[PDB]
Structure formats: structure tokens, C-alpha cells
Design a protein around this ligand. Structure first.
Ligand SMILES: [Zn+2]
Ligand SMILES: [Zn+2]
Ligand SMILES: [Zn+2]
Length: 148
RNA sequence: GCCCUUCGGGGCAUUUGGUCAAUUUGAAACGAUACAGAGAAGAUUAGCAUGGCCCCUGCACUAAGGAUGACACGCUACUCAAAGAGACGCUA
């Protein structure tokens, strides 16, 4: 349960959690630090970029600990996905052909753009200009096409 | 990056965003202060309307209030002459 239980109604995590617990608290403390990052010098939409970046990083850590290295059990993986330690839909896109490096879900929400497009960061870099350092207004992505 | 392959080649994925963060120079509103002081032909006053490039409060743009909310109190030649005498004089 994502809802907090006091101490005596908490159930223990599945086995193998204590091996990755330090990195999980590293990601949690990184996100808590991302909460307190000055917005005085950057545009408003740039204030929310590190949260999407850290969510991507933590989901990628869980995803490649289970699918590439296979160093965690399936029960532990489903418990991590169910208790908010990884974004299950972003992982689900990562297992698809062409979305393996997708930055975030909001960058493929085609129903919510002006002309029903994806984000410009979904575009392969070869079809973009040189000296064009694009930086996604949704998350700060600099290009998340699979060929990149 | 991955997948398919008759290793010739092919496939999956496809253009975000009305926002400079940056307050003197792209537009807030008063109050205090000074000043003036609430309509109906003596004095004192309850009101209800009327007209709209005057509004305020209100959910009320089918209430009720805001001094009867305020405002009105001004300014004023022009559809415009005819007579029958007399007369400085005109004139037949
Ligand atoms: Zn994104
Ligand atoms: Zn994007
Ligand atoms: Zn992206």
C-alpha cells in the first residue's frame, strides 16, 4: 500500500529488497532535493523537469535490474511496481518496439497537443537540424528516439 | 536501440511549445488630509418612478439597496406676415 501504516500493520517487503534499498533511498532523496530547487532563475516549465528525470531514472533502475541483469525476483519486481517505486506504464512503453528509450508518458500523449503530434523529442536526430539542441518543454528531454 | 531477413534488404518509433525567471518606463485602488455639504414654491422630511456613451453592492441580466444612488434645475431670433393712414421725403 502506498498509504502509510504505523508500525504494527506494516507488512515486510519481499526478499531482496534490502540489497537495493540504499539506491531506492538515493532516488527518494534525489527527488526530495528536486522538490527544493530554486525556480527564480528558470522558466516555470523548467522547474518540473528534474522530477520527470528522476522518475525516469528510478523506473529505469528497476526495469534493468529485473529485465537485463535479472538480479531481483518477480515478486519483488511487482511489489516495487505496485508500491510506487517504478512507473509501470513507462516501463510498459519501454518494452515496446520504438519506445525503448522514451523519456516520459506525457511526450506521447497525442490527444493533448495542438496538432495531434508527439513531442519533438520523439523525432530521430538525423531528421533534425545541426546545432539544434532541442530541450522538451514537458520534461527537458534532448531526444528520446530509439535510434538516438 | 531492437526486430525480421529469400544477407539482397526491410521493419518498429516521427516535429513539443499564446510562458524570457528578471516588477523603475504598458497603465490597480484608496484612505488620511483639506474642502464642500443630503430633493419637492416657509420650516422639517417618508418615498415610487421616468431617460442613458453615469454607476456601485448584490446570485438576482424578471429582488432589494446605494441621499427618493447620482445626474436633470440649463439655454432660448428664423416654416413667420398682412393692413391705413399720416409722413422728414421718395415717386407716379
Ligand atoms: Zn518527455
Ligand atoms: Zn518531449
Ligand atoms: Zn523525450
Amino acid at each position: 500500500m502506498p498509504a502509510i501504516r504505523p508500525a504494527s500493520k506494516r507488512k515486510p517487503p519481499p526478499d531482496g529488497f534490502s540489497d537495493i534499498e540504499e539506491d531506492l533511498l538515493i532516488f527518494a532523496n534525489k527527488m526530495k532535493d528536486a522538490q527544493n530547487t530554486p525556480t527564480d532563475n528558470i522558466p516555470k516549465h523548467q522547474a518540473q523537469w528534474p522530477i520527470f528525470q528522476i522518475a525516469h531514472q528510478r523506473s529505469r533502475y528497476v526495469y534493468e535490474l529485473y529485465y537485463q541483469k535479472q538480479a531481483i525476483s518477480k515478486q519483488l519486481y511487482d511489489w516495487l511496481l505496485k508500491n510506487g517505486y517504478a512507473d509501470a506504464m513507462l516501463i510498459a512503453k519501454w518494452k515496446k518496439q520504438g519506445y525503448e528509450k522514451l523519456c516520459c508518458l506525457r511526450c506521447i500523449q497525442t490527444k493533448e497537443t495542438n496538432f495531434n503530434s508527439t513531442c519533438i523529442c520523439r523525432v530521430p536526430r538525423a531528421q533534425l537540424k545541426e546545432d539544434q539542441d532541442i530541450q522538451c518543454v514537458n520534461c527537458g528531454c534532448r531526444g528520446c528516439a530509439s535510434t538516438d
